[PDB]
Amino acid sequence: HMASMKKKGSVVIVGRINLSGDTAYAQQTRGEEGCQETSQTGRDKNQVEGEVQIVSTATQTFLATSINGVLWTVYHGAGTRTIASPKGPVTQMYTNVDKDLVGWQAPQGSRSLTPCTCGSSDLYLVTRHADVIPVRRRGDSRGSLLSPRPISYLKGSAGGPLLCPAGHAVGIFRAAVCTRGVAKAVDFIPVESLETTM
Ligand SMILES: COc1cnc(O[C@@H]2C[C@H]3C(=O)N[C@]4(C(=O)NS(=O)(=O)C5CC5)C[C@H]4/C=C\CCCCC[C@H](NC(=O)OC(C)(C)C)C(=O)N3C2)c2cc(Cl)ccc12
Ligand SMILES: [Zn+2]
């Protein structure tokens, strides 16, 4: 019935992938119970840092990447959900189910990657475990892993970046190309598709 209809939670930032050292590592900034509360209220008073966020809904965890002042992630992860912020829930600024892309205004304190202009096919995929994986660009939206990995390794990383050697955002990871449970390639949303969206 209509009087007791439930709301869907906000996406919640629960950690980050630190890329600002000589070492990449994941940091958690909020645990599960805290995440649940924040998802319902939408009020997240934590201080955000960096380019790559670890984000959660009540049922899934994945990544989000800031580019040009926008925090971007995958639709199949975020749906049309708001994101928790210091002032309450923030509505998506961009939503495109066909591209599997959503975005919100980037959090105060985050930093954005610059969209890539270098034309390079030597790419680097950043996973939720802070692995930095070399990927050879193969097309507009595809790249090959130099070393194939079981998918289990890539699961939870949709929304993360593909970076060029200069650390320029090239795209947002979206899907794994798989055979017999082995990812041999990745599908991504090119940074150029985000700029058309913007
Ligand atoms: C809303 O539009 C949409 C929804 N879903 C998907 O694709 C789904 C979700 C991804 C996914 O899990 N991403 C992931 C992911 O990690 N998602 S997530 O973070 O874990 C989830 C969001 C919380 C990058 C892949 C990671 C693990 C692989 C597990 C299953 C792989 C199957 C699969 N691959 C496949 O679809 O590839 C084709 C296009 C070549 C046919 C796949 O990766 N996905 C299947 C797509 C894919 C594409 Cl190309 C375009 C749109 C679109
Ligand atoms: Zn470049």
Q: What is the DSSP string of 101-165?
A: EEEEEPPTTB--BPBP-S---EEEEEPTT--EEEEEE-SSSEEEEEEEEEGGGTTT-TTPEEE-T
Span from the CA of 33 to the centroid of ligand 1 (angstroms): 27
Distance from the alpha carbon of residue 189 to the mean position of ligand 2, in angstroms: 16
Question: What is the CATH architecture assignment of 114-198?
Answer: Beta Barrel (2.40)
Do the beta carbons of residue 55 and residue 13 sit within 8 Å?
yes
Closest-CA residue to 109 (of 183, 68, 55, 48): 48
d(CA 10, CA 7): 9
User: Residue 97: CB within 6 Å of ligand 1?
Assistant: yes
The alpha carbons of the chain give a radius of gyration, in whole angstroms, of 16
Q: Which atom of ligand 1 is nearest to the CA of 75?
A: 1
Tokens representing 59 are 């049922």
Q: What is the resolution of this structure in A?
A: 2.7
> Whose alpha carbon is nearest atom 27 of ligand 1?
155
User: What kind of experiment solved this structure?
Assistant: X-ray
Contacts of 85 (CB under 8 A, 6+ apart): 42, 43, 44, 107
**Residue showing tokens 């958690």:** 28
- Residue 84 has a CB neighbour count (10 Å cut-off) of 30
Domain 1-113 class in CATH = mainly beta
d(CA 49, CA 20): 10
Maximum alpha-carbon separation in the chain: 55
- In the chain, CATH 2.40.10.120 sits at 1-113
List the end-to-end C-alpha distance of the chain, in Å, as a whole number.
39
Q: What CA dihedral angle connects 114, 130, 181 and 99, to 10 degrees?
A: -30
Q: CA-CA distance, 180 to 61, in Å (whole number)?
A: 24
| Start-end of CATH 2.40.10.10 domains in the chain | 114-198
Ligand 1 centre and the CA of 63: distance in Å? Answer: 13
